[PDB]
Amino acid sequence: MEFIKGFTFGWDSQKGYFKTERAKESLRLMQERTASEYVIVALAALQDTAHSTEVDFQGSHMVDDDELIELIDYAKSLGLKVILKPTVNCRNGTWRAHINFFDMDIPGEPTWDEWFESYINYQKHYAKIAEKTNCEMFVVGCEMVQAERREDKWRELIAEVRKDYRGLVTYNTDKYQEDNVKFWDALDVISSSGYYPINDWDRQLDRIEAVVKQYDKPFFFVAAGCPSRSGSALLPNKWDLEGAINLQEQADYYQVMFEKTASRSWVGGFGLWDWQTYLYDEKDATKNDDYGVFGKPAERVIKAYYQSR
Numbered sequence: 001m002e003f004i005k006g007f008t009f010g011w012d013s014q015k016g017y018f019k020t021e022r023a024k025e026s027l028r029l030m031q032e033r034t035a036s037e038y039v040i041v042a043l044a045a046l047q048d049t050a051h052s053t054e055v056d057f058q059g060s061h062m063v064d065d066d067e068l069i070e071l072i073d074y075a076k077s078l079g080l081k082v083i084l085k086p087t088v089n090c091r092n093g094t095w096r097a098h099i100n101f102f103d104m105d106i107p108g109e110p111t112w113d114e115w116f117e118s119y120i121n122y123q124k125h126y127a128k129i130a131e132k133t134n135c136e137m138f139v140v141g142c143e144m145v146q147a148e149r150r151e152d153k154w155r156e157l158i159a160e161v162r163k164d165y166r167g168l169v170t171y172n173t174d175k176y177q178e179d180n181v182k183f184w185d186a187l188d189v190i191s192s193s194g195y196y197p198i199n200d201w202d203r204q205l206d207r208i209e210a211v212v213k214q215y216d217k218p219f220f221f222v223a224a225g226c227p228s229r230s231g232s233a234l235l236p237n238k239w240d241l242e243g244a245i246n247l248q249e250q251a252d253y254y255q256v257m258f259e260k261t262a263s264r265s266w267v268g269g270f271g272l273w274d275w276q277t278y279l280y281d282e283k284d285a286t287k288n289d290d291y292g293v294f295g296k297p298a299e300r301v302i303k304a305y306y307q308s309r
């Protein structure tokens with residue numbers, strides 16, 4: 001696997017967003033400012049709670065199929081390769097890592113089989129879209145920590161995706177959970193959300209390396225990044241962390257991440273988190289405390305590193 005110079009796009013999208021000129025302008029700027037060669041198109045269906053069984057990919061929160069295909073085609077017209085990442089959020093705000101059901105099927109209770117039926121039907125539809133648009137890679141799940149123990153069901157889902165899509169298939173585990181997944185043999189690429197502290201890369205990379213060596217598969221950090229916020233460099237996954245604006249802390253985080261991972265031949269790339277569809281005005285970048293790097297010192301750090309690889 002070539003080194004993946006990637007950037008996540010579309011997380012903020014809602015139905016209709018991908019029809020707009022400003023979505024195209026934002027993607028053009030993502031490529032120009034970062035020298036990314038892959039875009040990770042990250043989308044989120046909705047379910048009501050962490051313990052309900054219906055996965056909705058048709059409502060106002062989700063781009064329509066026609067505009068999604070339009071955006072994917074436009075990305076390819078720019079020379080980008082495309083990784084499609086359809087995941088799921090909860091309407092009550094619970095992180096999807098907590099999605100979970102009783103081990104047993106209890107009368108009148110929601111079951112694992114019910115949830116997986118709805119989630120499989122969701123994944124198969126977007127796998128067909130990934131096939132039609134020739135996406136380079138497809139991500140069947142994201143940070144589903146408590147669901148990862150249902151090995152048999154994840155294998156069933158992956159086999160369903162294989163019937164619809166001929167490209168590379170991966171699953172995105174959460175930080176520290178790279179060994180929690182036992183179905184890596186059924187996938188083409190291992191990936192995780194590499195939200196590791198600025199001062200702990202050595203221990204975490206050594207741990208992941210040993211996991212990755214157990215399988216014969218390439219690896220990359222399909223999500224990674226850090227807000228421009230004081231304190232974020234120690235807990236970069238924490239999107240709701242409280243702290244003052246700090247552009248330099250974000251740049252320092254990226255500098256260390258790239259320096260530490262560059263010497264690991266098995267770290268095969270990044271899907272940096274994240275580049276918004278409705279991008280803030282560049283004049284507001286020095287006051288933006290979010291993950292975005294547009295107009296911030298980390299933008300130049302990323303572009304320089306991607307151009308070196």
Ligand SMILES: OC[C@H]1O[C@@H](O[C@H]2[C@H](O)[C@H](O)[C@H](O)O[C@@H]2CO)[C@@H](O)[C@@H](O)[C@@H]1O
Nearest residue numbers: 011044089143193223236237238239273
């Ligand atoms: O899921 C809604 C929340 O997403 C947050 O971004 C997370 C994302 O869920 C996923 O965990 C990814 O790997 O890291 C992102 C940054 O931590 C935020 O966008 C937040 O506003 C959202 O409600």
